[PDB]
Structure 1
């Protein structure tokens, strides 16, 4: 509360560490469905169904331009990518499996890096 602070966790390296993690995401062989925005003009249903589209290039732009106020907002956007993927794609599809693989991949790097 007022004049009562929790010990401040060191966050000075978060920007660099999230960038590193995103780089490993981008270079994963199953990253291809998530590198660019889904094309809203060509994919039926997607614009109406997926209220908040997200992808790695958009996350990269936001990270590079100071649009994540903290660790958690970055993680929320990464998870949003995979939540969207689950909403729109069957689990037993190439893209569906990609999403599951990438989410697993992310959450490990996230745990290892910050926990």
Structure 2
């Protein structure tokens, strides 16, 4: 509350560390469905159904330009990529499987880097 703070967690490396995690997501072999925005002209249904499209390139641009206020807003966008993927793709599809795999990969890096 006012003049009453928990001890200050060192957040000075969060930016660099989120960048590293993102690099590792970018370079994973199953990243291909996620590297670029879904083409809303060429994919029937996407625009209407997925209210907040997100992809790794858009996360990278937001990261690089100080549009994440803290590491939680960064994780929210990464998770949004996978939540979108599950919303539109059957579990038993290459993309559906890609999304599950990438989510697992992300969540482990996240825990090991920060928790």
TM-score for both structures, normalised by structure 2: 1.00
Residue 55 of structure 1 deviates from its aligned partner by 0.1
Q: How far 1:8 sits from its partner (Å)? A: 1.0
Give the aligned partner of residue 61 of structure 2.
Answer: 61
State the partner residue of 2:11: 11
Task: Supply the RMSD in Å over aligned alpha carbons.
Answer: 0.2
Structure 1 residue 28: Cα displacement: 0.0
Unaligned runs of 5+ in 1: none
Stretches of 4+ moved more than 3 A in 1?
A: none
**Rounded Cα–Cα distance in structure 1 between residues aligned with 2:82 and 2:8:** 31
Alignment partner of 1:20 is 2:20: yes
CA shift for structure 1 position 99? 0.1
- Tell me the alpha carbon deviations over residues 44-101 of structure 1, each in whole angstroms, 9 at most, x when there is no partner: 0000000000000000000000000000000000000000000000000000000000
Secondary structure of 1:26's partner? helix
**Displacement of 1:33 after TM fit?**
0.3
Cα distance in 1, alignment partners of residues 64 and 107 from structure 2: 21
Which blocks of at least 5 consecutive residues in structure 2 are unaligned?
none
Provide Cα deviations, 1:18-58, integer angstroms capped at 9, x if missing partner.
Answer: 00000000000000000000000000000000000000000
